[PDB]
Design an enzyme around this catalytic site. Structure first.
Site, mmCIF file in Angstrom:
data_model
loop_
_atom_site.group_PDB
_atom_site.id
_atom_site.type_symbol
_atom_site.label_atom_id
_atom_site.label_comp_id
_atom_site.label_asym_id
_atom_site.label_seq_id
_atom_site.Cartn_x
_atom_site.Cartn_y
_atom_site.Cartn_z
ATOM 1 N N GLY A 10 0.814 -1.208 0.000
ATOM 2 C CA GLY A 10 0.000 0.000 0.000
ATOM 3 C C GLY A 10 0.847 1.255 0.000
ATOM 4 N N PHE A 12 2.579 9.716 3.417
ATOM 5 C CA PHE A 12 3.851 10.226 2.899
ATOM 6 C C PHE A 12 4.864 9.143 2.491
ATOM 7 C CE2 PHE A 12 4.766 14.442 1.900
ATOM 8 C CZ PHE A 12 4.152 15.351 2.761
ATOM 9 N N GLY A 13 4.375 7.939 2.194
ATOM 10 C CA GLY A 13 5.253 6.872 1.734
ATOM 11 C C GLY A 13 4.592 5.628 1.173
ATOM 12 N N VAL A 15 4.290 1.032 1.720
ATOM 13 C CA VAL A 15 4.337 -0.092 2.643
ATOM 14 C C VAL A 15 4.569 -1.387 1.846
ATOM 15 C CG1 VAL A 15 3.144 -1.289 4.516
ATOM 16 C CG2 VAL A 15 2.794 1.120 4.209
ATOM 17 N N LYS A 30 7.647 0.103 6.264
ATOM 18 C CA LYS A 30 6.968 1.351 5.923
ATOM 19 C C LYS A 30 7.995 2.438 5.675
ATOM 20 C CE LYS A 30 3.158 4.370 7.221
ATOM 21 N NZ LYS A 30 1.954 4.457 8.089
ATOM 22 N N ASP A 121 -8.210 5.868 13.354
ATOM 23 C CA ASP A 121 -8.575 5.368 12.023
ATOM 24 C C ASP A 121 -8.731 3.841 11.930
ATOM 25 O OD1 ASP A 121 -9.204 5.714 9.181
ATOM 26 O OD2 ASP A 121 -7.115 5.168 8.764
HETATM 27 O O1 LIG Z 1 1.541 -6.910 8.422
HETATM 28 C C1 LIG Z 1 1.529 -5.679 8.420
HETATM 29 N N1 LIG Z 1 2.136 -4.904 9.315
HETATM 30 C C2 LIG Z 1 1.908 -3.626 9.007
HETATM 31 C C3 LIG Z 1 2.330 -2.453 9.630
HETATM 32 C C4 LIG Z 1 1.958 -1.214 9.125
HETATM 33 C C5 LIG Z 1 1.170 -1.161 7.989
HETATM 34 C C6 LIG Z 1 0.737 -2.328 7.358
HETATM 35 C C7 LIG Z 1 1.103 -3.572 7.860
HETATM 36 C C8 LIG Z 1 0.869 -4.902 7.492
HETATM 37 C C9 LIG Z 1 0.131 -5.489 6.453
HETATM 38 N N2 LIG Z 1 -0.037 -6.804 6.338
HETATM 39 C C10 LIG Z 1 -0.767 -7.100 5.274
HETATM 40 C C11 LIG Z 1 -1.182 -8.333 4.763
HETATM 41 C C12 LIG Z 1 -1.967 -8.390 3.615
HETATM 42 C C13 LIG Z 1 -2.326 -7.195 2.985
HETATM 43 C C14 LIG Z 1 -1.906 -5.956 3.489
HETATM 44 C C15 LIG Z 1 -1.120 -5.907 4.644
HETATM 45 C C16 LIG Z 1 -0.556 -4.884 5.395
HETATM 46 N N3 LIG Z 1 -0.631 -3.576 5.126
HETATM 47 O O2 LIG Z 1 -1.643 -3.015 4.395
HETATM 48 C C17 LIG Z 1 -1.223 -1.896 3.576
HETATM 49 C C18 LIG Z 1 -1.382 -0.557 4.330
HETATM 50 C C19 LIG Z 1 -2.552 0.307 3.802
HETATM 51 O O3 LIG Z 1 -2.073 1.579 3.292
HETATM 52 C C20 LIG Z 1 -3.564 0.575 4.928
HETATM 53 O O4 LIG Z 1 -3.492 -0.466 5.903
#
Ligand SMILES: O=C1N=c2ccccc2=C1c1[nH]c2ccccc2c1NOCC[C@H](O)CO
Ligand SMILES: O=C1N=c2ccccc2=C1c1[nH]c2ccccc2c1NOCC[C@H](O)CO
Lengths: 311, 312
Positions: A10, A12-13, A15, A30, A121
């Site tokens: 996913g 300011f950056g 993931v 992140k 959130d």
């Molecule tokens: O396992 C995760 N630890 C995190 C710490 C900070 C932000 C995201 C995650 C983790 C995610 N695990 C996943 C497994 C399947 C699909 C997505 C995720 C994770 N993040 O999701 C993306 C962030 C998005 O911008 C909003 O949550």
């Protein structure tokens, strides 16, 4: 060099999924654009979250524009993807499972609130689930803050589905209670199969809440925001007429105790854990529910603890 | 950087070590500030990050600053064993054996913990051994010279220090083991009893001779065990610690010392077995936390050994 890059998760950056070059283990990265002059609020909160139902900090470092790289505990699925899959297949998430997810959620929120910390959130995209355990973990504290009760916040929180009504009323003196409204919203959606309160604007969102729970009284408006004022008069509706045709009474009773207008009146997380709706979890797939840390034990009241625990 | 206020200097050893204050919580920590390129890993931070034990100094925070510096915030303890040792001498008294046992027990527990990870400290000395007077808690600090020993790879012999190195280091060993820490412990134990260090000398030969003059000339088999890549000294018989150490010294003290200061690195008493040693039978029969083993500790202490360590 120590982290090899995997799938983007996913933006300011950004993931990502990363791998520890030495141990083989998989973590979440992140990467955020950041000045090493100022502090990073999100890192600073991470640093203090040591709980079984919350995503753990593992490592952090700086890189090259200058970026902060936060390495965190990884969990392979989100409640968002689980929920969409049940709809997709044509069936309802079993209530037994809903309870498993929601209990753990309450436990997490109980913990951050014992530190004055508010997530702000909570949403199914933020609730990480393990398929093999049914373990749920709360993540992403990029939007979180330690609420200083003697100090006003500025009203700048805009988001669909899960905001507490007091945020829609521009409250300046909101409390961690706002999270409790989010849990309620998540809980309902899981049951209904779609969100409780849609709408693009604050007005839109308020109206939808009013449409179901009735027009707030004046006493209720003050308690949400004393700085703010008239709607049309609409009577409350019964959740039993809103939710799907099979819904257990215990589920609705707990829901009624969460989604209250009066922030101060919403059920306490540990109180909610002691609620009859979880009585079947107490009567022994299930993850860890009762392995309280010595910190949690110091914080849960003795009357409550005994009702939460099995015989 | 704003988070912490300075800060009495504690030692300028590639950086400095200070006292600092958390401006939010009011708590006191130790700051180690080192000159560091954010292009490379920092070995010491990487080791810190893994040390979670009641008798070792915990990592708390770390950040960068400006020449670029790495700032390591750590758990703080208000005194060193060096200052304690060096104060007893002043008063013209010896450290009670009951106290000596408190410190050395905890030291073993710390070392037991780092060796379970292949981490070796490589510079144990009373300056690195923090003591708290409220409690008699000892903590092992300053891992700037520590390393994780990879048994299948050689190290380079570049360890030069006074009083506390293992004989194998003095012999240029390339295949040394965390056992070298146990030699240091033995020395520290010894010094606490005697009132001065066991093995003085500014060079390696100078250091070896002193050891040889007390413990006797090593046999050929003992040379191979310390360094199979290294060859003659004059023949000297071992002296008896009972004639080196002060008149009073208990026999169990010496028994325990004998089992640490062996030439053969692989024969030195191992830390958990040392806690089981009868010299600590008074702590068991009868003072800080000593028996509050972590779940991790419990899983790596052997069964029979554990039972001998615990009180009846
Ligand atoms: O396992 C995760 N630890 C995190 C710490 C900070 C932000 C995201 C995650 C983790 C995610 N695990 C996943 C497994 C399947 C699909 C997505 C995720 C994770 N993040 O999701 C993306 C962030 C998005 O911008 C909003 O949550
Ligand atoms: O409490 C300490 N935590 C540390 C972590 C790394 C390095 C040093 C310390 C700590 C010290 N506490 C002290 C109390 C009194 C006097 C000195 C110290 C500490 N270190 O001082 C510098 C270390 C030097 O090797 C011994 O003088």
């Amino acid at each position: 060099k120590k982290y090899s890059l995997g799938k983007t998760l996913g933006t300011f950056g950004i993931v990502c999924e990363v791998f520890d070059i030495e141990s083989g283990k998989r973590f979440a990265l992140k990467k955020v654009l950041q000045d090493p002059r100022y502090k990073n609020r999100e890192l600073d909160i991470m640093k203090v979250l040591d709980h079984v139902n919350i995503i753990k900090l593992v490592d952090y470092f700086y890189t090259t524009n200058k970026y902060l790289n936060v390495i965190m505990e990884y969990v392979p699925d989100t409640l968002h993807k689980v929920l969409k899959s049940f709809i997709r297949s044509g069936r309802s998430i079993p209530m037994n499972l809903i309870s498993i997810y929601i209990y753990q959620l309450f436990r997490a929120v109980g913990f951050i609130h014992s530190l004055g910390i508010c997530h702000r959130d909570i949403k199914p995209q933020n609730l990480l689930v393990n398929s093999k355990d049914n373990t749920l973990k709360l993540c992403d504290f990029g939007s979180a803050k330690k609420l200083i009760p003697s100090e006003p916040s500025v009203a700048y929180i805009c988001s669909r589905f899960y905001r507490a009504p007091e945020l829609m009323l521009g409250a300046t003196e909101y409390t961690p209670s706002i999270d409790l409204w989010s849990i309620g919203c998540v809980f309902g959606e899981l049951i209904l199969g779609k969100p409780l309160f849609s709408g693009e604007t604050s007005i839109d969102q308020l109206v939808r809440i009013i449409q179901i729970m009735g027009t707030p009284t004046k006493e209720q408006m003050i308690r949400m925001n004393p700085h703010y004022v008239r709607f049309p008069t609409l009577k409350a509706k019964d959740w039993r007429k809103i939710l799907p045709e099979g819904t257990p009474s215990l589920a609705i009773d707990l829901l009624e105790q969460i989604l209250r207008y009066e922030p101060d009146l919403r059920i306490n997380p540990y109180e909610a854990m002691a609620h009859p709706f979880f009585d079947h979890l107490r009567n022994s797939n299930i993850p860890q529910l009762f392995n309280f840390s010595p910190y949690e034990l110091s914080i849960i009241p003795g009357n409550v603890l005994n009702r939460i625990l099995p015989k």
